[PDB]
Motif scaffolding. Structure first.
Motif, PDB file in Angstrom:
ATOM      1  N   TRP A   8      -8.893  71.278   7.762  1.00 59.82           N
ATOM      2  CA  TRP A   8      -8.458  70.730   9.035  1.00 59.82           C
ATOM      3  C   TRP A   8      -6.946  70.812   9.096  1.00 59.82           C
ATOM      4  O   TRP A   8      -6.263  70.315   8.199  1.00 59.82           O
ATOM      5  CB  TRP A   8      -8.912  69.285   9.216  1.00 59.82           C
ATOM      6  CG  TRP A   8      -8.378  68.700  10.459  1.00 59.82           C
ATOM      7  CD1 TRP A   8      -8.511  69.210  11.702  1.00 59.82           C
ATOM      8  CD2 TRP A   8      -7.656  67.478  10.603  1.00 59.82           C
ATOM      9  NE1 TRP A   8      -7.897  68.400  12.620  1.00 59.82           N
ATOM     10  CE2 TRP A   8      -7.364  67.325  11.967  1.00 59.82           C
ATOM     11  CE3 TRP A   8      -7.221  66.504   9.714  1.00 59.82           C
ATOM     12  CZ2 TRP A   8      -6.662  66.242  12.463  1.00 59.82           C
ATOM     13  CZ3 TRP A   8      -6.521  65.428  10.207  1.00 59.82           C
ATOM     14  CH2 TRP A   8      -6.250  65.304  11.568  1.00 59.82           C
ATOM     15  N   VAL A   9      -6.421  71.446  10.133  1.00 58.78           N
ATOM     16  CA  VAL A   9      -4.982  71.579  10.295  1.00 58.78           C
ATOM     17  C   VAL A   9      -4.611  71.214  11.727  1.00 58.78           C
ATOM     18  O   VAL A   9      -5.229  71.689  12.683  1.00 58.78           O
ATOM     19  CB  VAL A   9      -4.498  72.986   9.892  1.00 58.78           C
ATOM     20  CG1 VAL A   9      -5.323  74.062  10.541  1.00 58.78           C
ATOM     21  CG2 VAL A   9      -3.042  73.178  10.253  1.00 58.78           C
ATOM     22  N   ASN A  10      -3.628  70.333  11.871  1.00 59.59           N
ATOM     23  CA  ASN A  10      -3.258  69.747  13.150  1.00 59.59           C
ATOM     24  C   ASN A  10      -1.774  69.982  13.369  1.00 59.59           C
ATOM     25  O   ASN A  10      -0.946  69.367  12.697  1.00 59.59           O
ATOM     26  CB  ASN A  10      -3.582  68.258  13.153  1.00 59.59           C
ATOM     27  CG  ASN A  10      -3.403  67.622  14.502  1.00 59.59           C
ATOM     28  OD1 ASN A  10      -3.074  68.281  15.484  1.00 59.59           O
ATOM     29  ND2 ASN A  10      -3.609  66.316  14.560  1.00 59.59           N
TER      30      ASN A  10
ATOM     31  N   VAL F 123       6.245  63.760  11.565  1.00 60.05           N
ATOM     32  CA  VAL F 123       5.186  64.592  11.008  1.00 60.05           C
ATOM     33  C   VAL F 123       5.008  65.838  11.863  1.00 60.05           C
ATOM     34  O   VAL F 123       4.793  65.752  13.077  1.00 60.05           O
ATOM     35  CB  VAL F 123       3.878  63.804  10.907  1.00 60.05           C
ATOM     36  CG1 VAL F 123       2.731  64.728  10.595  1.00 60.05           C
ATOM     37  CG2 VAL F 123       4.004  62.754   9.838  1.00 60.05           C
ATOM     38  N   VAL F 124       5.098  67.001  11.229  1.00 59.37           N
ATOM     39  CA  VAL F 124       4.895  68.263  11.920  1.00 59.37           C
ATOM     40  C   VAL F 124       3.462  68.750  11.799  1.00 59.37           C
ATOM     41  O   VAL F 124       2.822  69.040  12.814  1.00 59.37           O
ATOM     42  CB  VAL F 124       5.899  69.304  11.410  1.00 59.37           C
ATOM     43  CG1 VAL F 124       5.567  70.662  11.970  1.00 59.37           C
ATOM     44  CG2 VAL F 124       7.259  68.892  11.869  1.00 59.37           C
ATOM     45  N   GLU F 125       2.907  68.844  10.591  1.00 59.61           N
ATOM     46  CA  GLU F 125       1.484  69.145  10.534  1.00 59.61           C
ATOM     47  C   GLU F 125       0.819  68.459   9.353  1.00 59.61           C
ATOM     48  O   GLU F 125       1.437  68.193   8.319  1.00 59.61           O
ATOM     49  CB  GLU F 125       1.168  70.645  10.489  1.00 59.61           C
ATOM     50  CG  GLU F 125       1.238  71.312   9.153  1.00 59.61           C
ATOM     51  CD  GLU F 125       0.956  72.790   9.254  1.00 59.61           C
ATOM     52  OE1 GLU F 125       0.757  73.275  10.386  1.00 59.61           O
ATOM     53  OE2 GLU F 125       0.914  73.466   8.207  1.00 59.61           O
ATOM     54  N   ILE F 126      -0.447  68.152   9.558  1.00 61.91           N
ATOM     55  CA  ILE F 126      -1.359  67.638   8.553  1.00 61.91           C
ATOM     56  C   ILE F 126      -2.269  68.776   8.131  1.00 61.91           C
ATOM     57  O   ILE F 126      -2.677  69.593   8.960  1.00 61.91           O
ATOM     58  CB  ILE F 126      -2.177  66.471   9.131  1.00 61.91           C
ATOM     59  CG1 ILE F 126      -1.243  65.429   9.727  1.00 61.91           C
ATOM     60  CG2 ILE F 126      -3.042  65.825   8.070  1.00 61.91           C
ATOM     61  CD1 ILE F 126      -0.434  64.718   8.711  1.00 61.91           C
ATOM     62  N   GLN F 127      -2.576  68.846   6.842  1.00 60.87           N
ATOM     63  CA  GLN F 127      -3.520  69.828   6.326  1.00 60.87           C
ATOM     64  C   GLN F 127      -4.397  69.167   5.279  1.00 60.87           C
ATOM     65  O   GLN F 127      -3.940  68.896   4.170  1.00 60.87           O
ATOM     66  CB  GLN F 127      -2.787  71.021   5.739  1.00 60.87           C
ATOM     67  CG  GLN F 127      -3.720  72.078   5.262  1.00 60.87           C
ATOM     68  CD  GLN F 127      -2.996  73.301   4.803  1.00 60.87           C
ATOM     69  OE1 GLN F 127      -1.770  73.360   4.837  1.00 60.87           O
ATOM     70  NE2 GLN F 127      -3.739  74.241   4.257  1.00 60.87           N
ATOM     71  N   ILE F 128      -5.654  68.930   5.624  1.00 56.30           N
ATOM     72  CA  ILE F 128      -6.590  68.198   4.787  1.00 56.30           C
ATOM     73  C   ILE F 128      -7.751  69.106   4.442  1.00 56.30           C
ATOM     74  O   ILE F 128      -8.394  69.660   5.339  1.00 56.30           O
ATOM     75  CB  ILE F 128      -7.098  66.944   5.496  1.00 56.30           C
ATOM     76  CG1 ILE F 128      -5.948  65.986   5.730  1.00 56.30           C
ATOM     77  CG2 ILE F 128      -8.166  66.277   4.681  1.00 56.30           C
ATOM     78  CD1 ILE F 128      -6.328  64.837   6.607  1.00 56.30           C
ATOM     79  N   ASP F 129      -8.014  69.273   3.155  1.00 53.00           N
ATOM     80  CA  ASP F 129      -9.180  70.015   2.705  1.00 53.00           C
ATOM     81  C   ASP F 129     -10.213  69.042   2.157  1.00 53.00           C
ATOM     82  O   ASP F 129      -9.908  68.257   1.258  1.00 53.00           O
ATOM     83  CB  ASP F 129      -8.790  71.018   1.629  1.00 53.00           C
ATOM     84  CG  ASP F 129      -7.869  72.062   2.153  1.00 53.00           C
ATOM     85  OD1 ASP F 129      -7.942  72.307   3.360  1.00 53.00           O
ATOM     86  OD2 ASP F 129      -7.104  72.655   1.368  1.00 53.00           O
TER      87      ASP F 129
END
Ligand SMILES: Nc1ncnc2c1ncn2[C@@H]1O[C@H](COP(=O)(O)OP(=O)(O)O)[C@@H](O)[C@H]1O
Ligand SMILES: Nc1ncnc2c1ncn2[C@@H]1O[C@H](COP(=O)(O)OP(=O)(O)O)[C@@H](O)[C@H]1O
Ligand SMILES: Nc1ncnc2c1ncn2[C@@H]1O[C@H](COP(=O)(O)OP(=O)(O)O)[C@@H](O)[C@H]1O
Lengths: 36, 67, 232, 449, 441, 439, 66
Positions: A8-10, F123-129
């Protein structure tokens, strides 16, 4: 190219979810529209 | 006590210097643990079990109850 | 202590011990699923359940020391516990804010080992140079310093700094020690304060109170004085 | 740096021939008590003791516990000294005889050498190897690993049990975490990420340590100071190992339980096995039971069998009572509250009251101990209050009289400051006189009788 | 090492003759008491008989007249065969459980079951170990061992190789492979491979090779009481309770079924019942709720012989308000049989002080012994037996060899006997807190 | 709200001479005990002298708890001040002595100082795996201030906090790196017009300047009891809130005392000694005093201040009497401060303060009648009459209270001096120690 | 339906040479022994066995405290 991790990337434009190709045949792709 | 152990005179002067620098150069204890009451298995030597060894859960209590 | 067990010399006693005192159903229920079971549950065509549906171990309520009694000497109580090191800690934070790769010089390089541990600990990219490194390694690591603008702290022997080495990219000096010969100290200063030096290099000589390094400072200062008046 | 009630006491102050010299090392006078306490101290430091009774009689305010702190500072740091009271043993979990025996085995120490076997490495490859698991409900079960430890000089690639894997697993050891597997219990504390994976762009607030130098299979000896009650608690509620009783036994709340006779004998045999191997050294100590008259008859009954043991520390009882009634059975009166049968074990040390000059010396020592300097007329005034009212009342008129001195810009305490502090702060006798006089009738401005 | 000199470390048995039951006046520590020691000898010889129930013998007598001494003599004159259990009567008033049940466990602790069965063990030095873990695993391996006489090779199962890497058997260890279970107790290290041990201490013991054959059968004899079996058959893994006291109210059907299976073990010849001794020290500290249970626990076939000691004269019974002799109710004094002791003559005092002096190894001049006997005439045995230990140390103050009058007269000067302490209380009334008043000079 | 000790704003003495002012900061009308309590307060603020005992004796309704709350308001929220009542000690969970030991060790603050590392920025981007059906998580966080542009990594707990906070793209968050909390401060963009379940538009903040990794030095004060509970139990934390602490053995306290002494020497910690106030100590029995007298013997004992009411009373758990219900081996250690009953010219101004606190306006005739009532029934009846007369004047719609309102309140609500007579008149229709009849 | 493993039979005894089992001989009787037993149960045992799980699967009782 991960085996079982779903990304998931936002960012500032939107937010997308990547699914690896190896999970599309599995039951994990039923929500994403792949299925068995 | 020495003008009247480890009594070297340059242990005196240069360990004044060392205890300026850092006290743990003079010997410090390494990372501790609580005392253990049971009976483990002591390793015999270092020069035998070279690379592929297997640990065994050898922890038993010295307190035994014989039935 | 481990719990008390029964020394009964049958096979059934050993089987009952390894089925009660260990009892793998509770261990499986407590710690979680085997990764093989995770694979066969996450690559299957249909969703299937798990008998430990998540890891049922409770989260420990003390972050640094969980479920054991083992003690590591904590980093603040490990190598800090000295005022020289305390002021050095402050000034190293200050020079990190300054953005200047500095130096060390010391007499007894086991202190340099323990400072290496301190600096690897508080996350500073560093390089080490004593007499123990071979000559090609000496010139190559000082070349690797002088080509790279980011590795932050040196380690040097004071007296073996009197080589023909080059430290123009260095810009600040810290003496952790003040031993006898002023010309060694000033010589290492010259190894910083080179002919190719661009900016002001400041030098910090760490001093204690009421202790023998003040005596050596005074004696060396007198010897420096006699030296400079004779050959001025 | 806090001046308590007992700070000036630094020891008994004895000569080489065991003769008490007065006004030395804190005490003032009190000869026949300090010589007997020196005899008790050398009875402790000779190890021919398996239970001796030493009673400290004498009225309140005569320094019974000052002798106890003198003994505890004369024995040293490395000899056990357990001070309790008579009200401490009335518990709600266990019977009080259990608390007595727990104090008796707190008062016996042991100095043991141990050889820990650490495996101190950096984890390189962590790969589980499960075994066969047929239909038995629980499913698969990891049974074998291949963790590779990488020290500075010579790596090693070792194989683990299931239980040590669960010890790893409840520590959250990833690839890169330095650990040291303790092969006595099985415990294994993660220390931190190795500095080969160092990155200043980090968020977990990990503790980066370098690679542990030396051989990966180290072996180190330490010295440990363990009492027998520590071994009793260790074998009673197990909290070591990697099985289920010793893991579900440290999530529950800890409760004091009744360690029985059989465990207290088996640990004695284990300690004798340690001593016969030339490893451990036994050092017996003191149980100081202050206010022994609060113990009832069910405790003086059990002290007989507790002192008949072949291993039992020396008991020092304090009791500031005259002819009084024992707490348990209210129909036999005796001296000190001690029953007349238990009293014959005791080597009774008396303690006599003080003199109008010894009070002056104690006031001078207490003033130069707290840090309050004053004049000799003020010392005579405080000694006059000490003769008239009490001993430990006149010592307490120095702490306000300093503060009041600092009110009036003074440094030393004069007669006026003590003459004001004797009016602001009262004793018990004049307060009871005001109570009886003013509190004539109950009502609005009376006292609840 | 855990043999510190106590107040009863000089008694090495009851000391009486075992052929005509004559109490010879000075043997094994017990010196002077004649009629009471003969009656204790009769009781001791009917304990080892076994053909009697749980009966009750009350050792009544004045303080410090040798009652715990006679009980400890009977304890030392049985060995570790017939179970002797001490019980000071304030261990009963617990909070983990009730009070009558705490008494019942103390009755059940003194009825042993003695069974003798065989095991097969292996001595010997390991010559070498080879384990075929090559990726392989614990599958096959060879074990070569020897005694002084034998030498042998064995092949090993998988569940033995997993016990060999469990105990880490080196090349030179002296192990004991119990064949029926598989545990390995390393008895020590062999001397002849002293070079081959690097990860050991500088001071390390070394044994010799075991002598004799390498495969022998041991006839071990175990003896556990009925309370042991009761606590074992009470939880899932419940024997830990009898090491931690966390046992509660054990249901009575378990005790009844174990009383049945012990009889079925006796009738099949698989077992043998040994009735022990229960010593209830200070029996006057029981209330009438205890005596109304001891009156019926001394009725069954499985009941140990109770020996008990009372100090009080005509005193009150706890729980009730009415007085009675020895602090015991009369319906319970019908059960017991009383042995009365006597105070000590002065020559017996002198030789008891002589035994207590020779036990601690303190030299005495005969003048000091005469003075000490004169003190013990007026202050009891306990005071003089502490003056011995004090006077040795006071002689060690001024660097002397033998104690004398000049040290007994110092020990008598510093440490008051309790009679002078009672006089001190009576002559210092107004400052010692009697009940109400505190006077400060 | 307005409790019975809300008008008090300290003790009301001088700072240089500590003379008792006759009217200052609520505590108005007494001079001796307030001056002595000022001396006690000064030797508590010194912190050097350990293990004393102050006994505030006197008749009831004379302001003993008022002097105690005056010292409590005068120390501020720095020094611990335990308001222990003497009946709380008699537990059924733990023993009677260990409750006293906890009550002493709750009043010795330990003040430690530690460095945390706080972040700041947009916050510029979130990256959750995430895995499927149980498993670890992976995280990459790109954050930007006006100067730096960092790409940080995350563990499992950070992602468990991010998903709990729902940190989207364009949030001004501040992460403590040590503790690991996330506090959203607001946004820099607006709300998107593409998704439905987004949330509430937060505060409009700009992009923060400066640096990312900033350091902060925080000060944490814990009592010794909290250290005892967190070091007495392996996993069973939080039992210092829900009171589930059974017993702490002495091996734990004798180690924690030594470690606190080592923390005192290292400059890590500082010991702030505190006050243990015991309200109405006459309820404790002699088994408590035989421990209270000996806990005041060490360097870690708090300066005990305690109250009393009784004359020659019998000590509980015993058979004999003593002044104040306290034993005469314990009354040697203590120091007794007397309080006196009041005078009507002081009751007048005390009722004036209590009336001005509860926002009640009066007439001087009503205040004179109220003072006349307070002479005969104490303050505890007069203050209740103040509030009651306020509400009765509110019922009949009057601005200020009057004589009639006070007479109405005096007629309705009896003082105890008339309820005693009401008991003593009709003794046949009240259950004494005997039977009762019905007309 | 109650089962117990008595041991390993002595015909398979010396398969390996230091296995660790209890080698017992083959029983020299019938394989199917049929016997009848009269046996009593008290109602209190019914009460206890119906209230709380007892003995067999009650493995959490090895903690002991609560
Ligand atoms: N010989 C002495 N020298 C100095 N101070 C003493 C002496 N004897 C008693 N004291 C003082 O008396 C006070 C109380 O003594 P303590 O032992 O508590 O009395 P008690 O014997 O009633 O317990 C202590 O503060 C101590 O300073
Ligand atoms: N016959 C004896 N031989 C040797 N010592 C004795 C004898 N009788 C009594 N003693 C000693 O006298 C002391 C008191 O005996 P004990 O039985 O303890 O008294 P009590 O009956 O009051 O408990 C004991 O320490 C014991 O050593
Ligand atoms: N000197 C005073 N100054 C201010 N208020 C007081 C004073 N004396 C008494 N009071 C008031 O009277 C009430 C009773 O005081 P309190 O200390 O509760 O009495 P007691 O000591 O009998 O419990 C308190 O609510 C307080 O507000």
């Amino acid at each position: 190219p991960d085996p079982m991790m779903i990304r998931w990337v936002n960012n500032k434009m939107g937010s997308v979810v990547a699914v690896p190709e190896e999970l599309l045949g599995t039951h994990a792709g039923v929500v994403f529209g792949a299925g068995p | 006590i020495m003008d009247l152990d480890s009594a070297t005179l340059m242990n005196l002067v240069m360990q004044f210097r060392k205890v300026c620098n850092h006290p743990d150069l003079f010997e410090r204890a390494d990372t501790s643990s609580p005392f253990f009451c049971g009976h483990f298995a002591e390793t015999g030597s270092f020069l035998r079990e070279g690379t592929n060894v297997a640990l065994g859960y050898s922890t038993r209590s010295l307190v035994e109850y014989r039935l | 202590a481990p719990p008390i067990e029964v020394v009964c010399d049958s096979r059934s006693a050993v089987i009952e011990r390894e089925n009660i005192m260990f009892h793998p159903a509770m261990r499986k229920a407590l710690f979680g699923p085997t990764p093989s079971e995770i694979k066969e549950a996450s690559f299957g065509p249909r969703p299937v359940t798990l008998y430990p549906p998540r890891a049922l171990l409770p989260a420990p309520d003390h972050d640094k020391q969980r479920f054991t009694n083992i003690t590591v000497p904590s980093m603040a109580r490990f190598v800090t516990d000295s005022g020289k090191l305390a002021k050095l800690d402050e000034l190293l934070r200050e020079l990190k804010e300054g953005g200047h790769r500095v130096l060390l010089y010391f007499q007894m390089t086991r202190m340099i080992d323990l400072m290496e541990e301190y600096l690897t600990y508080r996350n500073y990219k560093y390089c080490r140079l004593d007499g123990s490194t071979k000559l090609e390694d000496r010139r190559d690591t000082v070349a690797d310093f002088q080509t790279r603008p980011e590795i932050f702290i040196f380690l040097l022997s004071t007296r073996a700094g009197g080589l023909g080495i080059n430290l123009t990219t260095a810009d600040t000096v810290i003496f952790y020690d003040s031993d006898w010969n002023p010309t060694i100290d000033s010589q290492a200063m010259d190894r910083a304060h080179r002919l190719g030096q661009t900016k002001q290099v400041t030098v910090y000589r760490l001093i204690t109170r009421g202790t023998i390094e003040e005596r050596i400072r005074k004696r060396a200062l007198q010897k420096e004085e006699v030296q400079r008046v004779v050959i001025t | 740096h806090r001046t308590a009630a007992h700070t000036h006491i630094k020891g008994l102050g004895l000569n080489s021939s065991g003769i008490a010299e007065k006004q030395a090392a804190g005490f003032v006078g009190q000869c026949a008590a300090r010589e007997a306490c020196g005899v008790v101290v050398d009875l402790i430091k000779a190890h021919k003791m398996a239970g001796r009774g030493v009673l400290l009689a004498g009225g309140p305010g005569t320094g019974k516990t000052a002798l106890a702190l003198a003994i505890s500072q004369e024995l040293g740091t490395k000899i056990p000294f357990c001070p309790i009271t008579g009200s401490e043993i009335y518990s709600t979990e266990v019977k009080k005889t259990e608390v007595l025996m727990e104090n008796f085995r707190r008062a016996i120490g042991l100095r043991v050498r141990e050889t820990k076997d650490v495996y101190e490495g950096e984890v390189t490859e962590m790969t589980p190897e499960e075994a066969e698991n047929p239909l038995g409900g629980y499913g698969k079960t990891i049974s074998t690993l291949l963790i590779g430890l990488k020290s500075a000089r010579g790596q090693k690639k070792l194989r683990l049990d299931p239980s040590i894997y669960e010890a790893i697993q409840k520590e959250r050891v990833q690839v890169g975490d330095v650990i040291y597997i303790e092969t006595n219990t099985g415990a294994c504390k993660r220390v931190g990420r190795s500095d080969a994976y160092a990155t200043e762009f980090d968020l977990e607030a990990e503790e980066y340590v370098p690679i542990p130098k030396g051989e990966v299979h180290k072996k180190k000896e330490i010295v440990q100071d363990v009492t027998l009650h520590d071994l009793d608690v260790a074998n009673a509620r197990p909290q070591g190992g990697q099985d289920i009783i010793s893991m579900m036994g440290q999530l529950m709340k800890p409760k004091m339980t009744e360690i029985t006779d059989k465990l207290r004998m088996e640990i004695n045999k284990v300690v004798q096995k340690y001593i016969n191997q030339g490893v451990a050294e036994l050092i017996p100590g003191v149980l100081f039971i202050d206010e022994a008259h609060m113990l009832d008859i069910e405790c003086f009954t059990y002290l007989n069998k507790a002192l008949e043991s072949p291993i039992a520390p020396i008991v020092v009882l304090a009791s500031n009572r005259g002819i009084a009634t024992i707490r348990g059975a209210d129909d036999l009166k005796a001296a000190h509250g001690i029953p007349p049968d238990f009293l014959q074990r005791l080597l009774i040390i008396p303690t006599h009251p003080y003199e109008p000059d010894e009070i002056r010396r104690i006031v001078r020592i207490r003033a130069q101990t707290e840090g309050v300097q004053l004049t000799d007329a003020a010392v005579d005034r405080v000694a006059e209050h000490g003769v008239r009212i009490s001993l430990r009342y006149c010592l307490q008129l120095l702490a306000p009289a300093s503060i009041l001195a600092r009110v009036n810009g003074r440094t030393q305490v004069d007669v006026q400051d003590i003459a004001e502090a004797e009016e602001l702060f009262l004793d018990a006798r004049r307060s009871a006189n005001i109570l009886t006089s003013t509190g004539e009738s109950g009502g609005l401005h009376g006292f609840i009788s | 090492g855990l043999n510190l000199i106590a107040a009863h470390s000089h008694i090495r048995g009851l000391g009486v003759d075992a052929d005509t039951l004559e109490p010879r006046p000075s043997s094994q520590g017990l010196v002077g008491q004649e009629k009471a020691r003969k009656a204790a000898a009769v009781v001791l010889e009917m304990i080892k008989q076994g053909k009697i129930a749980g009966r009750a013998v009350l050792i009544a007598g004045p303080p410090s007249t040798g009652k715990t001494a006679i009980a400890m003599g009977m304890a030392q004159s049985l060995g570790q065969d017939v179970p002797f259990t001490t019980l000071a009567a304030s261990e009963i008033f617990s909070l983990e459980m009730s009070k009558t049940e705490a008494l019942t466990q103390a009755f059940r602790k003194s009825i042993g079951v003695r069974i003798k069965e065989e095991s097969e063990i292996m001595e010997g030095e390991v010559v070498e170990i080879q384990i075929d873990r090559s990726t392989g695993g614990a599958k096959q391996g060879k074990l070569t061992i020897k005694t002084t006489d034998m030498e042998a090779i064995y092949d090993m199962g998988s569940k033995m190789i997993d016990a060999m890497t469990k105990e880490r058997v080196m090349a030179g260890d002296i192990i004991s492979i119990d064949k029926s279970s598989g545990k390995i107790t390393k008895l020590g290290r062999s001397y002849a491979r002293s070079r081959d041990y690097d990860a050991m201490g500088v001071d390390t013991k070394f044994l010799q090779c075991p002598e004799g054959e390498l495969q022998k059968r041991k006839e071990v004899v175990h003896t556990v009481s009925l309370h042991e079996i009761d606590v074992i058959n009470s939880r899932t893994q419940g024997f830990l309770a009898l090491f931690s006291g966390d046992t509660g109210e054990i249901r009575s059907e378990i005790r009844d079924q174990i009383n049945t299976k012990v009889a079925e073990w006796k009738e099949e010849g698989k077992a043998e019942i040994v009735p022990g001794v229960l010593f209830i020290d200070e029996v006057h500290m029981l209330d009438i709720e205890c005596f109304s249970y001891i009156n019926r626990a001394l009725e069954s076939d499985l009941a140990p012989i109770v020996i008990m000691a009372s100090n009080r004269g005509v005193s009150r019974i706890r729980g009730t308000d009415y007085k009675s002799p020895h602090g015991l109710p009369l319906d319970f004094l019908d059960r017991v049989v009383i042995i009365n002791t006597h105070p000590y003559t002065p020559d017996e005092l002198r030789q008891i002080l002589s035994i207590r002096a020779q036990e601690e190894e303190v030299d005495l001049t005969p003048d000091a012994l005469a003075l000490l006997t004169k003190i013990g005439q007026e202050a009891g045995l306990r005071y003089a037996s502490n003056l011995i230990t004090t006077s040795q140390l006071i002689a060690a103050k001024r660097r002397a060899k033998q104690v004398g009058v000049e040290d007994v007269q110092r020990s008598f000067k510093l440490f008051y006997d309790p009679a002078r302490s009672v006089r001190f209380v009576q002559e210092s009334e107004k400052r010692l807190i009697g009940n109400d008043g505190v006077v400060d000079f």
